Each structure stands twice: as C-alpha cells, then as structure tokens.
Design a protein around this ligand. Structure first.
Ligand code: ADP
Ligand code: ADP
Ligand code: ADP
Ligand code: ADP
Ligand code: ADP
Ligand code: ADP
Ligand code: ADP
Ligand code: ADP
Ligand code: MG
Ligand code: MG
Ligand code: MG
Ligand code: MG
Ligand code: MG
Ligand code: MG
Ligand code: MG
Ligand code: MG
Lengths: 132, 132, 132, 132, 132, 132, 132, 132
C-alpha cells in the first residue's frame, strides 16, 4: 500500500509512475528540486531532501513505509550510505538499484534485501522475449 | 534460431548468455576486443567488428539472422548508425537499446522494431514486483 | 514570407542575410549569444534558444513559419534532434544541413524535406561552373 | 577540357565525379592513398602525391591543365602553400576552397583567381532556392 | 607483534617501512606486482593478491594477524569491500585509510575500528608543530 | 601569532581550523572562492587571491606573517611557484605540502624550510601508533 | 633609427626593450591592450591596434619606418596576412618571426626579407656557445 | 667534446645538428621515438629514454659527458625534473632551455648552470641585428 522511492532519475521516476497507477501511496524524495517537481504530479507526496543526512531520514519516517527504493545511480557512495542509514532507520524491506557488479557486491553484504541491476536484468528478459 | 547481438556491455552480454543458455546460437559483435574475448567463452561465434560500417555489416551477413539486437549504450550516434545500417542490410527484426526517449523516437523513425529502455522498463517491473 | 533559421554558423547567417535582403522576415535562433547578436543587426527577430528542447520550440511557434532551416553543423545529434522536434511541432517544410551521407539518410528517415550537403553540393556546383 | 583537382575530400571528390560525368579529363591528386583509390574509379588518372612539394608539382606538370582546383580545407597553411606553388609553376587559373574568411582573404591577396567558400556560397544558394 | 598491510601505495609503504624497523612481522599485500616488489625488501613477506576476493582473504589467514591496515585510496569501492571482507574473516581490529569524508562516514558504519584521513590528520599535526 | 595558509583543501582547512582553535590568527588564501567561504566562517581573515602572482603576494604582505603554509596539493607547478614567490617576498619560514618525493627535493632546492608529505608522514605516524 | 614592432609577446617585448635601450624610436603595436600597456613604459609610442586590418596599417605610416618586425606567433594566418599588408603598404624591409617550418616557407615565398625562427636559431647559437 | 642533448624538439635537434656538424659527438635522448629516429641519422648515438627517471639517467651515464643540454620545452615539469636528476647524478655543466622567467628562476635554484630563453634571447639578438 505505502511505498517510498529515493532518487528520481529515469529509473526512479518510472517506479513512481507505475506505483501510482495501482493506487498506492508513494513518497518520492530527491536531492534535486527539478526532479522532485517532475514527480510531484505522479506521487502522493514529493519532497526535496538529502537521504544521506541521517537526521533527515529520521524525520521522514521510512520505518512506517512498507518498502523503500533507493534509486541513486551516478554516485556509488551515496547509494551505499543511504542504504545503511535506511537500515538503522528501521526499514524492514530495502530495495537498492545498482549500476555495477562491484556496487552490487557491497550492497548485498551491507544488508540490502533486493539489488536491482537494470542492464543485467533487462538483458535476461529481452533475451526471453526474443526466444518467445 | 540464430541471433546477432551488437555491443557487449552489461545488457548485450546478459542477452547473449541467456540466448545461448536457452540453446540458441548467438553472434556477439563488438569493437572492444576485451569484451569480445569475454563473450567468446560461451557464444557460438564472436567477432571484433565495427557495425557502423556498411561493408563490415555486409561481411557479417546480418540478413541471415532472424533477430539482431543492437546494445550500444553510451554512443547514441553509433546506436542509430548501427540500426540504420542493419535495416538497410535487410534485417527482418531489429531490437535496439535506447537510453532516453528522444533516442527511442529517432530509432522509431529509423525503423527499429522493438526498442528497450533498460532504466524505465526495469523501473516498471520493479514497481509491479513490489506491488506483488 | 516568414522563415526560421536554426543555427547561425557560416551557412545559417548566409541564408538569413540572403533571405532578409530579399524582403522576407527571418527568425534567427542559436544557443551562442554572440552569433545571435551578430545576426540581430539585420535579422527581423533573433532569439537565443535551445532548439533541441521540445518545450522551447513550442514557445518559438515554428509551426507558424512557412519554412524552417536547421543549420546546426558540428553537433550532429543536435541536428537530428532539432529536425525531429520541428517535425513533431507541425512544421510543413524543414530544410536541414547535413555534413555526411550517413546523417542525411537519418534525416530522411526523420522527415526532413530538403537536405543540403554544403561540401558535396558546392563541389558539384563549382564543377559545373568550371565546365561552362 | 582538361582539369586537375588537388585534395580529394568530400568537396574534391564531388568536383571529380561531376567533372568526369560531364566527360572531361581530370587529374586527382591527394596525399592520402585510400582517398586516391576512392577517386581512381572515376577520374582519368589518380596520383598519390604531396602538392606542397615544389619538385612534385613540377613533375605533375600542372601548367598544361586548363584549371587546377585546390580542395585542401583542414590545414589552411597547406592550402596557401599549394596555391603559391601552383601560381609559381605557371597555372593560368587556380581555384581554391577556403573554409574561413581569414583564409579567403589571404588567398585573395596571394593571387587565387577563384575562392570557394562552400558554407557561405551554399547558404546564399539555399536561401535563393527557399525564396523561389 | 604481527601485522598485515593491504595496499602498497605511498601511505602503505610508509607503514611497512616503519613497522619492520621496530622488529615486528609485516605481511604486505597489493594487487599490483610492481609495488609488491618494492616492499619485498622492506617486509617479512610480500604477496601479490586481490583483497576483494573473498576466498583469497581466507587463504591469507588475516584473522591470525593482530592488526590489518587497508590502504587502498584511489578506488573507494575496493576499500569498502576489502574492509567488509576483512571483518567477515574474523579480524579483530581493522585500520582503513579514507581519502574523503564521505568514504570515512561509510567506513565508520561498516565497522572499521580506526579510520585514517592523511590530509585531515596531518593537517592537525602540522598546525600543532607550528604552534610550538 | 600570525599565520598564512595558502590553499584551502583538506590539509589547508585542517591546519587553519587547528591554528584558529588554538587562539592564533590565520590568513586563508585560495583561488577557489567556494573554499574561501567555509574558511571565512572561522578564519580571522580569508582572501580570494592567486599566490603564484608576484604583485598579488606583495599585496598580501606575507612578509608580516611569522609562518606561511602552502597547501597546494594537486597543482605541483602552483606549489613550486608559490614557494618561490613567498621566498622572494621575504617570509622567514615556509612550510610546504608535497605529494611527491621529487616535488619535495625541488622544494628543498627552492628554499622551503619544512616540507610535509601527508601520505608518507601519516603512514609513519600510523605505524608508530599501531606498534605502541 | 626608427623601427616598428608588431606583436608584443615575449619575443617582441624583448626586441622593443633592446631597441629602445640602444637609443632608437620604436612603435610597439599589439591588439591586446595589456601587452601594449606593458611595453608603453619602454617604447617611444605604444598603440593598441589590429595590424591585420588594412586601413589601420595604412593610417600607421609603416612605410616611413626603416624596419618593421612582425612578432605574431600563435596565429599563423595573422602573421602571413600582416606580412602581406605590410608589404602592400610599401614597407621596404619586413622581418617576420615564424614558429614552424611551413610558416617559414610561406613567409619566404610571400616576400619577407628576414624570417626568424627562435628555437632553431638559438639552437645553433647555444651549440656554438657550448663548442667555444 | 662529448655532449648530451635531452629533448629533440626544434631547439634540441638544432643544437645536435650544429654540435655534430662541428665535429663533436652528441648523444640525443628523447621519449618520442620519431624524433630519436630523425636525429639518429646524423648524431653519434641516439637513445629513446625517459630522463626524469633516476635509474634511466644512471644507465645513460650522463656524468661522463662534459655538457648536458636539456631542451624539454612544452613540459616544464619534465624540464625541472630532468635538471634536478642531471644535477644530482653528477653532471658538471647543465644547460637548460626555459620558456618563461619563472621557470628560469626555479632552474637557477635547482642548479642549472646556463639557462637559455629562446624567445627573449632571439628578441635581443634580432634587435641588435637590426640596429647594425
Ligand atoms: N543524497 C541524495 N539524496 C537524494 N537524492 C539523491 C541523492 N544523491 C543523488 N540523488 C538523486 O538520485 C537520482 C539518481 O540519478 P543518477 O542516475 O545517479 O544520475 P542522473 O540523473 O545523471 O542519471 C538523481 O535524480 C539524483 O538527484
Ligand atoms: N560502432 C560500434 N560497433 C560495434 N560495437 C560498438 C560500437 N560502438 C560501441 N560498441 C560497443 O557497445 C557496447 C556498449 O557499451 P556501454 O553501454 O558504453 O558500456 P556498459 O554497457 O558497460 O554501460 C560497448 O562495449 C562498445 O564496445
Ligand atoms: N541545440 C542547438 N540549438 C540551436 N543552435 C545550435 C544548437 N547546437 C548548435 N547550434 C548552433 O549552430 C551553429 C552552427 O554550428 P557549427 O557548424 O559548429 O558553426 P559553423 O557553421 O560556424 O562552423 C553554431 O553556431 C551553434 O551555435
Ligand atoms: N600537402 C598535400 N598535398 C596533397 N593533398 C593534401 C595535402 N594536404 C592535405 N591534402 C588532402 O586534402 C584533403 C582535404 O580534405 P579535408 O577538407 O581535410 O576533408 P575532411 O575534413 O573530411 O578530412 C585531404 O583529403 C588530404 O588528403
Ligand atoms: N582489490 C585490491 N586488492 C589489493 N590491493 C589493491 C586492490 N585494489 C587496489 N589495491 C592497491 O591499493 C593501492 C592504493 O594505491 P593509491 O595510493 O590509491 O594509488 P595512487 O598512488 O596511484 O593514488 C594501490 O597501489 C593498489 O595496488
Ligand atoms: N595559485 C593558487 N593560489 C592559491 N590557492 C591555490 C592555487 N592553486 C590552487 N590552490 C588551491 O590550493 C588547494 C590545493 O588542494 P587540492 O589538493 O587541490 O585539494 P584537496 O586537498 O581538497 O584534495 C585547493 O583549494 C586549490 O584550489
Ligand atoms: N592582428 C594582430 N594585430 C596586432 N597584434 C596581434 C595580432 N594578432 C596577435 N597579435 C599579438 O601578437 C602577440 C604574439 O602572440 P604569441 O606569439 O602567441 O605570444 P604568446 O604565446 O606570449 O601569446 C600576441 O600577444 C598578440 O597580442
Ligand atoms: N621526460 C622526458 N624525457 C626526455 N625527453 C622529453 C621528456 N619530455 C619531453 N621530452 C621531449 O622534449 C622535446 C621538446 O618538447 P617540445 O618543446 O614540445 O617540442 P618542440 O620543441 O618541437 O615544441 C619533445 O620532443 C619531447 O619529446
Ligand atoms: Mg538518470
Ligand atoms: Mg550497456
Ligand atoms: Mg555552418
Ligand atoms: Mg573532407
Ligand atoms: Mg599512492
Ligand atoms: Mg589537501
Ligand atoms: Mg609569446
Ligand atoms: Mg623546442
């Protein structure tokens, strides 16, 4: 029912649009104001915040949210650090998007429940669509 | 079924491994010999070639393969040129990977049959999967 | 007659100066403010705008102008993007300058009506000129 | 009608292909060997030579030719040197392609009979085509 | 007193040279063979290995060592990954060099017992030397 | 005591924060106005200036200050030039941060009084700390 | 007795300094105002002008000067065109500084009375100094 | 009667050519193999080596040669490093080419015996030549 999406890039905004279509509350948060405005018309609540800030994550009660998606791609260090802060925040289910195999290794060990690699994961499905 | 995959990045090598694991024969083509060596381990045939060159594409005999996947990610110019050359060669089905909506629309004008956006489509799937 | 010229390099400023000298109103658009200032002296209206931006083109109202000339030379990606946006904005006649035979074919697929190769066409013209 | 073309870029090859189609003797000279091979199919004679070399220009015997087209654009200094060698060699009429106004004015001062600026001239001609 | 140093950079060699002079056993590990040869004459044992490889760290038996110093600075992801693997290997105390404040924040959350920032730490020491 | 710190990166701002916390008045100079702003918060006086310029250094009156710390790290040329100009200005004591042994030798020849290699000196410090 | 120096770089400023110290009239001309101001203290008259402009060279009675030094190095076209304009203006002796051998060839063919190549000529001079 | 010239630009090859023409035996050293090849035609011995590397200079045995000329022009860092290494190797007389006065002063501090600034010194020489 209630979801949170951190990082509103091309991947993160795509999650927000589909989540809203199924009638679910989505908290879209992004450091960049422009990207938050784009998702403002597609989510229940759009907030400009830095999710690397520990106190900011405390205020945004992410432990209440059923699932939290971290969709930060360019800065590998932010996604790793935001994943950790969400874990101490009490988030039971943490989904993290990783662009590299080395990042996906770190995220697995630090405790991410689901690691998403869009290029590798889309590669497998597109092959399956080609086969059938 | 015989497939041709152009570009051997994260998406291209994932499609080849899935298409070769499913029992199909794949021709992996890339300009980087390092990635061609990686693909040559499991693909039926791997060739180091430039797929924006008309004579080179004629040499690869891409019209024989029923489906041609172009997975050139960073170089949008190379992706569009490869799609154009493959379509002119007489490839029945051309699948192209696109990073943005503008590249996807240009490829639609070029004549690409299926266009895959890894980030957006993976976001849609992640949203559906979180919705269970 | 009203003409819109996008890109104010050596070719674009020559078209504007020739078009305006004949009594036609020209709109000169470029991202480089120096060349927009240089054209503003003799051009009916000069605007500093990015014509690959689809919302910006709607503001320019390029659908009103009878012919739109896109004279972006160095940036081929910007050339195809501007042609695509102009066609999607409902421009009846789009003339595009192309620096290569591969760019010209992509522009033909996009929907450009007249494509000018400055080096090749001027070569043919001077070859005819020397003969006669 | 006997012609010589120096520099076999896009412009030079276009002058060679139009001149040969009209049915006149053309000498194509270019420092780069594969461009000479490309032009050899069309022109009567294609020679790989350096036209900034005084003795080479003397051996080419360019004073016989009715018109000499110097189509070197990338390096302005090579085009200037070759115009003077040609004019010292005794060529009656020398046509030179210039990419910049500074190059065009230098070539006018040194004695080029015809200076071709493909961007400006094609700009004027394209504007005239747009008018009618 | 038995020590291990991972990463034979300028910081790593300085630790290795000072440790051996006192009379304690030092294991020097670096992915690059050239740097391992440099410390081969300055440590008890110098091994070329990849310390982000989980099985390799097990073979090295780093849990026997009293202290391990991870001195990988150029690639932030390797230092984080090596720190986690060392902690999982059972090492009691792990000293990690961090070049950036963002890296040091992650390493503290990971569990590194001592984070060394050479620019910040030497900045304080140098100032105190200026005082007296 | 009056101190002058040139370059306000990690080392330079750490020396200034320590010097001012110890009750000393420090001058912070940097070409990056962004970093001069953080220093100006806690530094007695902060100036945006280029310290490789002789007239600029004469304007700063660095000869008044007891010690001049030059903490230009990435640009070794700027570090050498700043040390040379400071010595020619007439400053009694110059402390220079050097990231290379060769740079340290060149600075010794120039006339620097104390040269700090943060990586190597921090390595020695850390080794001594682990030993005891 | 009376000299003119065009271009006030490192070479031209040295020419002006030596010429004025010897006791002669020197008209120092440079398009850049900073260098003209720098040479204003030394030379009899320092003028900011573009010597590529033909009317400016006509206004500056360079034909009255015994010798004219053209010391433009970076832009070869500027030096060639300034030499041509000075020769057309009636200057009997024109000394031109050339940085490359192709530029020297062009200047020799144009008609410059003296071509100065500082690196080669000092190469010979310091070789002779080393020998004796 | 034995000289070593480091760097084989226009200045370095001119010193070599003159030194070998006067009967002396020159060792030409450069990192660019093309210039070492062109110098090897007339110099006594030519070596492709990096002269900023301490062990390489020891292999070259530069202490044997009475005079060592360092003609590295573009890379000021390489010029300073080569001068330092040659001086610490035990070369009695080191001549260095310097582009600017700041590099010249740094080289004076390093220990260079003769410093040649080609532009300024040719300015002085040409001024004296025009005077009488
Ligand atoms: N600390 C952060 N807190 C919140 N959002 C962030 C943070 N760091 C990055 N983001 C956002 O995460 C998104 C991921 O985008 P990314 O793929 O990294 O770059 P790009 O937008 O260039 O493709 C961006 O919209 C970015 O603003
Ligand atoms: N003209 C071309 N012909 C064939 N392959 C190409 C061409 N241009 C790029 N490629 C390949 O396409 C692949 C796509 O790589 P890229 O998307 O840049 O990296 P990644 O997939 O790791 O993000 C590259 O490995 C590159 O070698
Ligand atoms: N996205 C864009 N929108 C509008 N104008 C552009 C865009 N990209 C490039 N231009 C303009 O097109 C002009 C022609 O480009 P170019 O061929 O590089 O210059 P020139 O024709 O003088 O060599 C440039 O002056 C540039 O400012
Ligand atoms: N010294 C020379 N003698 C003869 N031909 C030359 C010389 N220098 C250059 N050329 C030729 O002139 C041509 C100029 O073409 P250019 O405008 O550079 O085409 P492009 O811009 O596509 O490289 C080149 O193909 C080159 O081979
Ligand atoms: N996975 C790894 N396992 C072991 N050692 C590594 C690994 N990755 C990097 N290193 C080593 O860590 C050292 C850190 O060196 P660093 O000081 O960052 O290099 P630089 O001086 O070029 O910045 C490197 O010499 C490298 O060889
Ligand atoms: N000429 C100069 N005068 C003053 N400050 C300079 C000059 N050149 C560089 N700096 C500054 O000196 C500092 C050197 O630190 P640097 O190593 O570049 O960054 P960091 O230590 O943060 O990694 C930077 O703040 C840089 O902008
Ligand atoms: N058209 C011109 N008229 C007069 N002076 C010029 C002209 N073009 C360039 N100059 C001057 O000639 C000087 C020589 O330039 P250059 O050889 O590049 O010296 P530097 O490398 O120190 O800039 C430049 O400082 C420039 O100001
Ligand atoms: N570390 C080095 N060791 C030896 N030779 C060098 C080194 N660095 C540069 N050189 C050489 O010094 C020569 C002079 O440099 P440069 O001034 O760029 O050439 P030019 O005199 O043609 O402008 C170059 O040809 C270069 O190959
Ligand atoms: Mg994005
Ligand atoms: Mg990819
Ligand atoms: Mg143009
Ligand atoms: Mg060409
Ligand atoms: Mg290091
Ligand atoms: Mg620093
Ligand atoms: Mg200069
Ligand atoms: Mg030189």
């Amino acid at each position: 029912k209630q979801f949170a999406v951190i990082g509103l890039g091309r991947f993160g905004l795509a999650v927000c649009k589909e989540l809203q279509d199924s009638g679910s509350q989505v908290l879209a948060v992004d450091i960049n104001e422009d990207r938050v405005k784009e998702a403002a018309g597609f989510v229940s609540q759009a907030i400009v915040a830095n999710c690397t800030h520990e106190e900011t994550v405390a205020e945004l009660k992410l432990d209440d949210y059923d699932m939290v998606m971290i969709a930060i791609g360019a800065d590998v260090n932010a996604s790793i650090l935001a994943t950790l802060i969400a874990k101490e925040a009490g988030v039971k289910s943490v989904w993290v998007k990783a662009n590299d195999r080395f990042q996906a290794r770190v995220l697995q060990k630090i405790g991410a429940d689901h690691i998403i690699m869009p290029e590798r994961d889309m590669g497998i499905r597109v092959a399956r669509k080609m086969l059938d």
